[PDB]
C-alpha cells in the first residue's frame, strides 16, 4: 500500500473486470500521452491504491498510444418479479487491454499515421500485471517494411501476436469454418475409438 | 539490436 491518496484527475483510468489500472498522464491536447513510470492498481471501484506487478521492461519516456479492449459479452436471463422487469441483461466483461505505440509518436491528424505494432503492451485483469507482447513479423520487407500494408492477427486468448501482409488475410467465414472442422474431427474420433474395429478402419 | 520481444 502506498499510504498516500492520489489525485486521479491526473491519471488515466482503465477499467477491467477485476481491477482498475492507473497510469500517469502528461498533459496533451488529444489525451494520448502515457508515462509508465508511475502506476497503481485498485480493487474494483474502491480506493486503496497499490503497486502493480511489472513483468517486463517498461518505457522510460513519453509514448503516444492507442487503447483497445479484449473480452466477452455475457447475456443472462434474470429472474422476473414485477410487471415490466427486464427480460435480459448484457455485460461487456473486459479481461485485457492492449496499448499500441503510435509510430514515431506521430499524431492522428498527420497524413503519416500508422501504428507500430512492434510495441504493444498488455494489461491483464486476473493477474494484475503489465507485460510486453512478443510479436512475430512474418512480413518480408525487413525492419524498413512499409507500415501502410501491415495487419496484426491476435489469436489464442491474447497470447499470440503476428504481423502479416494485408492481402493475405482470411475472410470471416473461413476463420469460423476452420475451427469447427478441427473440433468436429477430434470429437468423432473419440466416439469411434470405442468400437472394436477401429484399428482396422479408414477415415474417408 | 532486436529484443526477445520482436522475432523475424
JSON list of C-alpha atoms in Angstrom, two decimals:
[
{"chain": "A", "resi": 1, "resn": "UNK", "atom": "CA", "xyz": [0.00, 0.00, 0.00]},
{"chain": "A", "resi": 2, "resn": "UNK", "atom": "CA", "xyz": [1.28, 3.41, -0.99]},
{"chain": "A", "resi": 3, "resn": "UNK", "atom": "CA", "xyz": [-0.22, 5.27, 2.04]},
{"chain": "A", "resi": 4, "resn": "UNK", "atom": "CA", "xyz": [-0.96, 8.36, 0.03]},
{"chain": "A", "resi": 5, "resn": "UNK", "atom": "CA", "xyz": [-4.17, 9.08, -1.81]},
{"chain": "A", "resi": 6, "resn": "UNK", "atom": "CA", "xyz": [-3.52, 10.20, -5.33]},
{"chain": "A", "resi": 7, "resn": "UNK", "atom": "CA", "xyz": [-5.28, 12.78, -7.38]},
{"chain": "A", "resi": 8, "resn": "UNK", "atom": "CA", "xyz": [-6.93, 10.86, -10.02]},
{"chain": "A", "resi": 9, "resn": "UNK", "atom": "CA", "xyz": [-7.64, 13.78, -12.15]},
{"chain": "A", "resi": 10, "resn": "UNK", "atom": "CA", "xyz": [-4.06, 13.38, -13.33]},
{"chain": "A", "resi": 11, "resn": "UNK", "atom": "CA", "xyz": [-4.25, 9.72, -14.11]},
{"chain": "A", "resi": 12, "resn": "UNK", "atom": "CA", "xyz": [-5.67, 7.69, -16.96]},
{"chain": "A", "resi": 13, "resn": "UNK", "atom": "CA", "xyz": [-8.09, 5.17, -15.55]},
{"chain": "A", "resi": 14, "resn": "UNK", "atom": "CA", "xyz": [-8.54, 1.92, -17.33]},
{"chain": "A", "resi": 15, "resn": "UNK", "atom": "CA", "xyz": [-11.21, -0.41, -16.01]},
{"chain": "A", "resi": 16, "resn": "UNK", "atom": "CA", "xyz": [-11.08, -4.16, -16.28]},
{"chain": "A", "resi": 17, "resn": "UNK", "atom": "CA", "xyz": [-13.40, -6.66, -14.74]},
{"chain": "A", "resi": 18, "resn": "UNK", "atom": "CA", "xyz": [-11.43, -7.22, -11.56]},
{"chain": "A", "resi": 19, "resn": "UNK", "atom": "CA", "xyz": [-9.19, -4.19, -11.34]},
{"chain": "A", "resi": 20, "resn": "UNK", "atom": "CA", "xyz": [-8.65, -0.56, -12.13]},
{"chain": "A", "resi": 21, "resn": "UNK", "atom": "CA", "xyz": [-5.31, 0.43, -13.55]},
{"chain": "A", "resi": 22, "resn": "UNK", "atom": "CA", "xyz": [-3.89, 3.91, -13.33]},
{"chain": "A", "resi": 23, "resn": "UNK", "atom": "CA", "xyz": [-1.09, 5.29, -15.48]},
{"chain": "A", "resi": 24, "resn": "UNK", "atom": "CA", "xyz": [0.19, 8.89, -15.35]},
{"chain": "A", "resi": 25, "resn": "UNK", "atom": "CA", "xyz": [-0.96, 11.48, -17.75]},
{"chain": "A", "resi": 26, "resn": "UNK", "atom": "CA", "xyz": [1.24, 14.14, -19.17]},
{"chain": "A", "resi": 27, "resn": "UNK", "atom": "CA", "xyz": [-0.82, 16.94, -20.46]},
{"chain": "A", "resi": 28, "resn": "UNK", "atom": "CA", "xyz": [-1.67, 16.94, -24.16]},
{"chain": "A", "resi": 29, "resn": "UNK", "atom": "CA", "xyz": [-4.34, 18.14, -26.48]},
{"chain": "A", "resi": 30, "resn": "UNK", "atom": "CA", "xyz": [-5.89, 14.79, -27.54]},
{"chain": "A", "resi": 31, "resn": "UNK", "atom": "CA", "xyz": [-5.18, 12.91, -24.29]},
{"chain": "A", "resi": 32, "resn": "UNK", "atom": "CA", "xyz": [-2.96, 10.30, -25.90]},
{"chain": "A", "resi": 33, "resn": "UNK", "atom": "CA", "xyz": [0.32, 10.52, -23.96]},
{"chain": "A", "resi": 34, "resn": "UNK", "atom": "CA", "xyz": [1.35, 7.97, -21.35]},
{"chain": "A", "resi": 35, "resn": "UNK", "atom": "CA", "xyz": [4.02, 7.56, -18.65]},
{"chain": "A", "resi": 36, "resn": "UNK", "atom": "CA", "xyz": [4.70, 4.11, -17.50]},
{"chain": "A", "resi": 37, "resn": "UNK", "atom": "CA", "xyz": [6.86, 5.41, -14.71]},
{"chain": "A", "resi": 38, "resn": "UNK", "atom": "CA", "xyz": [4.02, 5.69, -12.15]},
{"chain": "A", "resi": 39, "resn": "UNK", "atom": "CA", "xyz": [1.32, 3.08, -11.97]},
{"chain": "A", "resi": 40, "resn": "UNK", "atom": "CA", "xyz": [-1.19, 1.84, -9.41]},
{"chain": "A", "resi": 41, "resn": "UNK", "atom": "CA", "xyz": [-3.86, -0.87, -9.32]},
{"chain": "A", "resi": 42, "resn": "UNK", "atom": "CA", "xyz": [-7.10, -0.88, -7.26]},
{"chain": "A", "resi": 43, "resn": "UNK", "atom": "CA", "xyz": [-9.87, -3.42, -6.34]},
{"chain": "A", "resi": 44, "resn": "UNK", "atom": "CA", "xyz": [-12.86, -2.52, -8.42]},
{"chain": "A", "resi": 45, "resn": "UNK", "atom": "CA", "xyz": [-14.45, 0.85, -7.50]},
{"chain": "A", "resi": 46, "resn": "UNK", "atom": "CA", "xyz": [-12.67, 1.08, -4.19]},
{"chain": "A", "resi": 47, "resn": "UNK", "atom": "CA", "xyz": [-9.88, 3.49, -3.24]},
{"chain": "A", "resi": 48, "resn": "UNK", "atom": "CA", "xyz": [-6.95, 1.84, -1.55]},
{"chain": "A", "resi": 49, "resn": "UNK", "atom": "CA", "xyz": [-4.12, 2.20, -4.04]},
{"chain": "A", "resi": 50, "resn": "UNK", "atom": "CA", "xyz": [-1.38, -0.38, -4.73]},
{"chain": "A", "resi": 51, "resn": "UNK", "atom": "CA", "xyz": [1.72, -1.11, -6.96]},
{"chain": "A", "resi": 52, "resn": "UNK", "atom": "CA", "xyz": [1.31, -3.43, -9.99]},
{"chain": "A", "resi": 53, "resn": "UNK", "atom": "CA", "xyz": [3.31, -6.42, -10.88]},
{"chain": "A", "resi": 54, "resn": "UNK", "atom": "CA", "xyz": [5.51, -5.36, -13.75]},
{"chain": "A", "resi": 55, "resn": "UNK", "atom": "CA", "xyz": [6.65, -8.38, -15.72]},
{"chain": "A", "resi": 56, "resn": "UNK", "atom": "CA", "xyz": [8.72, -6.66, -18.39]},
{"chain": "A", "resi": 57, "resn": "UNK", "atom": "CA", "xyz": [10.90, -3.67, -19.18]},
{"chain": "A", "resi": 58, "resn": "UNK", "atom": "CA", "xyz": [8.80, -0.51, -19.26]},
{"chain": "A", "resi": 59, "resn": "UNK", "atom": "CA", "xyz": [9.32, 2.65, -21.32]},
{"chain": "A", "resi": 60, "resn": "UNK", "atom": "CA", "xyz": [11.23, 5.47, -19.63]},
{"chain": "A", "resi": 61, "resn": "UNK", "atom": "CA", "xyz": [9.92, 8.26, -21.85]},
{"chain": "A", "resi": 62, "resn": "UNK", "atom": "CA", "xyz": [6.57, 9.63, -23.00]},
{"chain": "A", "resi": 63, "resn": "UNK", "atom": "CA", "xyz": [4.82, 7.49, -25.63]},
{"chain": "A", "resi": 64, "resn": "UNK", "atom": "CA", "xyz": [1.74, 8.23, -27.70]},
{"chain": "A", "resi": 65, "resn": "UNK", "atom": "CA", "xyz": [-0.54, 5.18, -27.64]},
{"chain": "A", "resi": 66, "resn": "UNK", "atom": "CA", "xyz": [-3.95, 3.83, -28.59]},
{"chain": "A", "resi": 67, "resn": "UNK", "atom": "CA", "xyz": [-6.12, 1.66, -26.28]},
{"chain": "A", "resi": 68, "resn": "UNK", "atom": "CA", "xyz": [-8.30, -1.36, -27.08]},
{"chain": "A", "resi": 69, "resn": "UNK", "atom": "CA", "xyz": [-10.26, -3.84, -25.02]},
{"chain": "A", "resi": 70, "resn": "UNK", "atom": "CA", "xyz": [-10.47, -7.63, -25.13]},
{"chain": "A", "resi": 71, "resn": "UNK", "atom": "CA", "xyz": [-13.25, -9.65, -23.67]},
{"chain": "A", "resi": 72, "resn": "UNK", "atom": "CA", "xyz": [-16.58, -11.41, -23.74]},
{"chain": "A", "resi": 73, "resn": "UNK", "atom": "CA", "xyz": [-20.18, -10.33, -23.70]},
{"chain": "A", "resi": 74, "resn": "UNK", "atom": "CA", "xyz": [-22.33, -12.08, -21.06]},
{"chain": "A", "resi": 75, "resn": "UNK", "atom": "CA", "xyz": [-26.08, -12.34, -21.63]},
{"chain": "A", "resi": 76, "resn": "UNK", "atom": "CA", "xyz": [-28.12, -13.56, -18.78]},
{"chain": "A", "resi": 77, "resn": "UNK", "atom": "CA", "xyz": [-31.76, -14.08, -18.17]},
{"chain": "A", "resi": 78, "resn": "UNK", "atom": "CA", "xyz": [-32.58, -12.61, -14.82]},
{"chain": "A", "resi": 79, "resn": "UNK", "atom": "CA", "xyz": [-35.45, -13.50, -12.54]},
{"chain": "A", "resi": 80, "resn": "UNK", "atom": "CA", "xyz": [-38.76, -11.56, -13.27]},
{"chain": "A", "resi": 81, "resn": "UNK", "atom": "CA", "xyz": [-40.58, -10.14, -10.23]},
{"chain": "A", "resi": 82, "resn": "UNK", "atom": "CA", "xyz": [-42.64, -7.24, -11.33]},
{"chain": "A", "resi": 83, "resn": "UNK", "atom": "CA", "xyz": [-44.75, -6.46, -14.30]},
{"chain": "A", "resi": 84, "resn": "UNK", "atom": "CA", "xyz": [-42.20, -4.80, -16.60]},
{"chain": "A", "resi": 85, "resn": "UNK", "atom": "CA", "xyz": [-38.99, -6.29, -15.19]},
{"chain": "A", "resi": 86, "resn": "UNK", "atom": "CA", "xyz": [-36.05, -6.72, -17.62]},
{"chain": "A", "resi": 87, "resn": "UNK", "atom": "CA", "xyz": [-36.01, -9.92, -19.71]},
{"chain": "A", "resi": 88, "resn": "UNK", "atom": "CA", "xyz": [-32.33, -9.98, -20.45]},
{"chain": "A", "resi": 89, "resn": "UNK", "atom": "CA", "xyz": [-29.17, -8.41, -19.08]},
{"chain": "A", "resi": 90, "resn": "UNK", "atom": "CA", "xyz": [-25.97, -7.81, -21.08]},
{"chain": "A", "resi": 91, "resn": "UNK", "atom": "CA", "xyz": [-22.47, -7.06, -19.75]},
{"chain": "A", "resi": 92, "resn": "UNK", "atom": "CA", "xyz": [-19.19, -6.36, -21.62]},
{"chain": "A", "resi": 93, "resn": "UNK", "atom": "CA", "xyz": [-16.75, -8.10, -19.24]},
{"chain": "A", "resi": 94, "resn": "UNK", "atom": "CA", "xyz": [-13.28, -6.84, -20.38]},
{"chain": "A", "resi": 95, "resn": "UNK", "atom": "CA", "xyz": [-10.30, -9.00, -19.50]},
{"chain": "A", "resi": 96, "resn": "UNK", "atom": "CA", "xyz": [-7.24, -7.45, -21.14]},
{"chain": "A", "resi": 97, "resn": "UNK", "atom": "CA", "xyz": [-6.26, -4.08, -22.55]},
{"chain": "A", "resi": 98, "resn": "UNK", "atom": "CA", "xyz": [-3.82, -3.62, -25.40]},
{"chain": "A", "resi": 99, "resn": "UNK", "atom": "CA", "xyz": [-1.92, -0.34, -25.74]},
{"chain": "A", "resi": 100, "resn": "UNK", "atom": "CA", "xyz": [-0.12, 0.21, -29.05]},
{"chain": "A", "resi": 101, "resn": "UNK", "atom": "CA", "xyz": [2.59, 2.78, -29.86]},
{"chain": "A", "resi": 102, "resn": "UNK", "atom": "CA", "xyz": [1.79, 5.34, -32.43]},
{"chain": "A", "resi": 103, "resn": "UNK", "atom": "CA", "xyz": [4.65, 5.38, -34.96]},
{"chain": "A", "resi": 104, "resn": "UNK", "atom": "CA", "xyz": [7.32, 7.89, -34.24]},
{"chain": "A", "resi": 105, "resn": "UNK", "atom": "CA", "xyz": [5.00, 9.36, -31.69]},
{"chain": "A", "resi": 106, "resn": "UNK", "atom": "CA", "xyz": [3.09, 10.90, -34.53]},
{"chain": "A", "resi": 107, "resn": "UNK", "atom": "CA", "xyz": [-0.43, 12.21, -34.19]},
{"chain": "A", "resi": 108, "resn": "UNK", "atom": "CA", "xyz": [-3.68, 11.11, -35.68]},
{"chain": "A", "resi": 109, "resn": "UNK", "atom": "CA", "xyz": [-4.18, 14.12, -37.80]},
{"chain": "A", "resi": 110, "resn": "UNK", "atom": "CA", "xyz": [-0.98, 13.78, -39.73]},
{"chain": "A", "resi": 111, "resn": "UNK", "atom": "CA", "xyz": [-1.09, 12.29, -43.11]},
{"chain": "A", "resi": 112, "resn": "UNK", "atom": "CA", "xyz": [1.62, 9.94, -41.88]},
{"chain": "A", "resi": 113, "resn": "UNK", "atom": "CA", "xyz": [-0.27, 7.95, -39.21]},
{"chain": "A", "resi": 114, "resn": "UNK", "atom": "CA", "xyz": [0.34, 4.36, -38.53]},
{"chain": "A", "resi": 115, "resn": "UNK", "atom": "CA", "xyz": [0.81, 2.25, -35.58]},
{"chain": "A", "resi": 116, "resn": "UNK", "atom": "CA", "xyz": [3.89, 0.44, -34.58]},
{"chain": "A", "resi": 117, "resn": "UNK", "atom": "CA", "xyz": [2.83, -3.00, -33.93]},
{"chain": "A", "resi": 118, "resn": "UNK", "atom": "CA", "xyz": [6.19, -3.92, -32.71]},
{"chain": "A", "resi": 119, "resn": "UNK", "atom": "CA", "xyz": [5.50, -2.21, -29.43]},
{"chain": "A", "resi": 120, "resn": "UNK", "atom": "CA", "xyz": [2.28, -3.43, -27.78]},
{"chain": "A", "resi": 121, "resn": "UNK", "atom": "CA", "xyz": [1.81, -3.68, -24.05]},
{"chain": "A", "resi": 122, "resn": "UNK", "atom": "CA", "xyz": [-0.81, -5.76, -22.29]},
{"chain": "A", "resi": 123, "resn": "UNK", "atom": "CA", "xyz": [-2.68, -5.28, -19.02]},
{"chain": "A", "resi": 124, "resn": "UNK", "atom": "CA", "xyz": [-4.22, -8.39, -17.51]},
{"chain": "A", "resi": 125, "resn": "UNK", "atom": "CA", "xyz": [-7.18, -8.46, -15.16]},
{"chain": "A", "resi": 126, "resn": "UNK", "atom": "CA", "xyz": [-6.67, -11.74, -13.43]},
{"chain": "A", "resi": 127, "resn": "UNK", "atom": "CA", "xyz": [-3.02, -11.30, -12.60]},
{"chain": "A", "resi": 128, "resn": "UNK", "atom": "CA", "xyz": [-2.86, -7.53, -12.06]},
{"chain": "A", "resi": 129, "resn": "UNK", "atom": "CA", "xyz": [0.10, -7.38, -14.33]},
{"chain": "A", "resi": 130, "resn": "UNK", "atom": "CA", "xyz": [1.51, -5.42, -17.13]},
{"chain": "A", "resi": 131, "resn": "UNK", "atom": "CA", "xyz": [3.73, -7.10, -19.74]},
{"chain": "A", "resi": 132, "resn": "UNK", "atom": "CA", "xyz": [5.03, -6.58, -23.25]},
{"chain": "A", "resi": 133, "resn": "UNK", "atom": "CA", "xyz": [3.99, -8.72, -26.13]},
{"chain": "A", "resi": 134, "resn": "UNK", "atom": "CA", "xyz": [6.09, -10.94, -28.34]},
{"chain": "A", "resi": 135, "resn": "UNK", "atom": "CA", "xyz": [5.34, -10.26, -31.97]},
{"chain": "A", "resi": 136, "resn": "UNK", "atom": "CA", "xyz": [6.45, -12.40, -34.89]},
{"chain": "A", "resi": 137, "resn": "UNK", "atom": "CA", "xyz": [6.80, -10.39, -38.05]},
{"chain": "A", "resi": 138, "resn": "UNK", "atom": "CA", "xyz": [6.42, -12.72, -40.96]},
{"chain": "A", "resi": 139, "resn": "UNK", "atom": "CA", "xyz": [6.04, -9.91, -43.34]},
{"chain": "A", "resi": 140, "resn": "UNK", "atom": "CA", "xyz": [9.01, -9.64, -45.71]},
{"chain": "A", "resi": 141, "resn": "UNK", "atom": "CA", "xyz": [10.44, -6.17, -46.06]},
{"chain": "A", "resi": 142, "resn": "UNK", "atom": "CA", "xyz": [12.74, -6.16, -43.11]},
{"chain": "A", "resi": 143, "resn": "UNK", "atom": "CA", "xyz": [12.81, -3.58, -40.41]},
{"chain": "A", "resi": 144, "resn": "UNK", "atom": "CA", "xyz": [12.03, -0.92, -43.02]},
{"chain": "A", "resi": 145, "resn": "UNK", "atom": "CA", "xyz": [8.86, -2.55, -44.33]},
{"chain": "A", "resi": 146, "resn": "UNK", "atom": "CA", "xyz": [6.06, -0.14, -45.02]},
{"chain": "A", "resi": 147, "resn": "UNK", "atom": "CA", "xyz": [3.62, 0.41, -42.24]},
{"chain": "A", "resi": 148, "resn": "UNK", "atom": "CA", "xyz": [0.72, 1.10, -44.57]},
{"chain": "A", "resi": 149, "resn": "UNK", "atom": "CA", "xyz": [0.37, -2.53, -45.57]},
{"chain": "A", "resi": 150, "resn": "UNK", "atom": "CA", "xyz": [0.54, -4.30, -42.26]},
{"chain": "A", "resi": 151, "resn": "UNK", "atom": "CA", "xyz": [-2.13, -6.17, -40.24]},
{"chain": "A", "resi": 152, "resn": "UNK", "atom": "CA", "xyz": [-1.86, -7.81, -36.84]},
{"chain": "A", "resi": 153, "resn": "UNK", "atom": "CA", "xyz": [-3.65, -11.03, -36.05]},
{"chain": "A", "resi": 154, "resn": "UNK", "atom": "CA", "xyz": [-4.32, -11.86, -32.39]},
{"chain": "A", "resi": 155, "resn": "UNK", "atom": "CA", "xyz": [-5.41, -15.36, -31.50]},
{"chain": "A", "resi": 156, "resn": "UNK", "atom": "CA", "xyz": [-5.22, -17.63, -28.54]},
{"chain": "A", "resi": 157, "resn": "UNK", "atom": "CA", "xyz": [-6.75, -15.62, -25.73]},
{"chain": "A", "resi": 158, "resn": "UNK", "atom": "CA", "xyz": [-4.46, -12.78, -26.36]},
{"chain": "A", "resi": 159, "resn": "UNK", "atom": "CA", "xyz": [-1.37, -14.84, -26.18]},
{"chain": "A", "resi": 160, "resn": "UNK", "atom": "CA", "xyz": [-0.36, -14.96, -29.85]},
{"chain": "A", "resi": 161, "resn": "UNK", "atom": "CA", "xyz": [0.71, -11.99, -31.87]},
{"chain": "A", "resi": 162, "resn": "UNK", "atom": "CA", "xyz": [1.78, -11.94, -35.57]},
{"chain": "A", "resi": 163, "resn": "UNK", "atom": "CA", "xyz": [2.22, -9.35, -38.30]},
{"chain": "A", "resi": 164, "resn": "UNK", "atom": "CA", "xyz": [1.35, -10.41, -41.78]},
{"chain": "A", "resi": 165, "resn": "UNK", "atom": "CA", "xyz": [0.72, -8.68, -45.05]},
{"chain": "A", "resi": 166, "resn": "UNK", "atom": "CA", "xyz": [-2.71, -7.23, -45.70]},
{"chain": "A", "resi": 167, "resn": "UNK", "atom": "CA", "xyz": [-3.95, -9.02, -48.74]},
{"chain": "A", "resi": 168, "resn": "UNK", "atom": "CA", "xyz": [-3.21, -12.36, -47.23]},
{"chain": "A", "resi": 169, "resn": "UNK", "atom": "CA", "xyz": [-5.92, -12.19, -44.62]},
{"chain": "A", "resi": 170, "resn": "UNK", "atom": "CA", "xyz": [-8.69, -14.66, -44.21]},
{"chain": "A", "resi": 171, "resn": "UNK", "atom": "CA", "xyz": [-12.35, -13.83, -44.61]},
{"chain": "A", "resi": 172, "resn": "UNK", "atom": "CA", "xyz": [-14.61, -14.05, -41.64]},
{"chain": "A", "resi": 173, "resn": "UNK", "atom": "CA", "xyz": [-16.36, -17.29, -42.68]},
{"chain": "A", "resi": 174, "resn": "UNK", "atom": "CA", "xyz": [-13.09, -19.13, -43.13]},
{"chain": "A", "resi": 175, "resn": "UNK", "atom": "CA", "xyz": [-11.96, -18.46, -39.65]},
{"chain": "A", "resi": 176, "resn": "UNK", "atom": "CA", "xyz": [-15.17, -19.86, -38.18]},
{"chain": "A", "resi": 177, "resn": "UNK", "atom": "CA", "xyz": [-15.25, -22.80, -40.51]},
{"chain": "A", "resi": 178, "resn": "UNK", "atom": "CA", "xyz": [-11.72, -23.82, -39.83]},
{"chain": "A", "resi": 179, "resn": "UNK", "atom": "CA", "xyz": [-12.35, -24.01, -36.18]},
{"chain": "A", "resi": 180, "resn": "UNK", "atom": "CA", "xyz": [-15.46, -26.04, -36.42]},
{"chain": "A", "resi": 181, "resn": "UNK", "atom": "CA", "xyz": [-13.75, -28.58, -38.61]},
{"chain": "A", "resi": 182, "resn": "UNK", "atom": "CA", "xyz": [-10.99, -29.19, -36.15]},
{"chain": "A", "resi": 183, "resn": "UNK", "atom": "CA", "xyz": [-13.23, -29.69, -33.21]},
{"chain": "A", "resi": 184, "resn": "UNK", "atom": "CA", "xyz": [-15.69, -31.84, -35.03]},
{"chain": "A", "resi": 185, "resn": "UNK", "atom": "CA", "xyz": [-12.98, -34.13, -36.31]},
{"chain": "A", "resi": 186, "resn": "UNK", "atom": "CA", "xyz": [-11.46, -34.74, -32.99]},
{"chain": "A", "resi": 187, "resn": "UNK", "atom": "CA", "xyz": [-14.83, -35.43, -31.47]},
{"chain": "A", "resi": 188, "resn": "UNK", "atom": "CA", "xyz": [-15.85, -38.08, -33.99]},
{"chain": "A", "resi": 189, "resn": "UNK", "atom": "CA", "xyz": [-12.65, -39.97, -33.43]},
{"chain": "A", "resi": 190, "resn": "UNK", "atom": "CA", "xyz": [-13.24, -40.01, -29.75]},
{"chain": "A", "resi": 191, "resn": "UNK", "atom": "CA", "xyz": [-16.61, -41.61, -30.34]},
{"chain": "A", "resi": 192, "resn": "UNK", "atom": "CA", "xyz": [-15.44, -44.13, -32.75]},
{"chain": "A", "resi": 193, "resn": "UNK", "atom": "CA", "xyz": [-12.45, -45.32, -30.75]},
{"chain": "A", "resi": 194, "resn": "UNK", "atom": "CA", "xyz": [-14.52, -47.46, -28.50]},
{"chain": "A", "resi": 195, "resn": "UNK", "atom": "CA", "xyz": [-15.60, -49.72, -31.28]},
{"chain": "A", "resi": 196, "resn": "UNK", "atom": "CA", "xyz": [-13.57, -52.94, -31.65]},
{"chain": "A", "resi": 197, "resn": "UNK", "atom": "CA", "xyz": [-12.88, -52.50, -35.28]},
{"chain": "A", "resi": 198, "resn": "UNK", "atom": "CA", "xyz": [-11.18, -49.09, -35.12]},
{"chain": "A", "resi": 199, "resn": "UNK", "atom": "CA", "xyz": [-7.68, -50.27, -35.68]},
{"chain": "A", "resi": 200, "resn": "UNK", "atom": "CA", "xyz": [-8.68, -51.81, -38.95]},
{"chain": "A", "resi": 201, "resn": "UNK", "atom": "CA", "xyz": [-10.68, -48.84, -40.33]},
{"chain": "A", "resi": 202, "resn": "UNK", "atom": "CA", "xyz": [-10.08, -45.80, -42.62]},
{"chain": "A", "resi": 203, "resn": "UNK", "atom": "CA", "xyz": [-11.28, -42.17, -42.40]},
{"chain": "A", "resi": 204, "resn": "UNK", "atom": "CA", "xyz": [-12.93, -41.23, -45.62]},
{"chain": "B", "resi": 1, "resn": "UNK", "atom": "CA", "xyz": [19.58, -4.98, -31.70]},
{"chain": "B", "resi": 2, "resn": "UNK", "atom": "CA", "xyz": [16.22, -6.74, -31.62]},
{"chain": "B", "resi": 3, "resn": "UNK", "atom": "CA", "xyz": [14.92, -7.72, -28.21]},
{"chain": "B", "resi": 4, "resn": "UNK", "atom": "CA", "xyz": [13.47, -11.07, -27.35]},
{"chain": "B", "resi": 5, "resn": "UNK", "atom": "CA", "xyz": [10.30, -9.15, -27.88]},
{"chain": "B", "resi": 6, "resn": "UNK", "atom": "CA", "xyz": [10.36, -8.96, -31.64]},
{"chain": "B", "resi": 7, "resn": "UNK", "atom": "CA", "xyz": [11.25, -12.04, -33.74]},
{"chain": "B", "resi": 8, "resn": "UNK", "atom": "CA", "xyz": [11.62, -12.11, -37.57]}
]
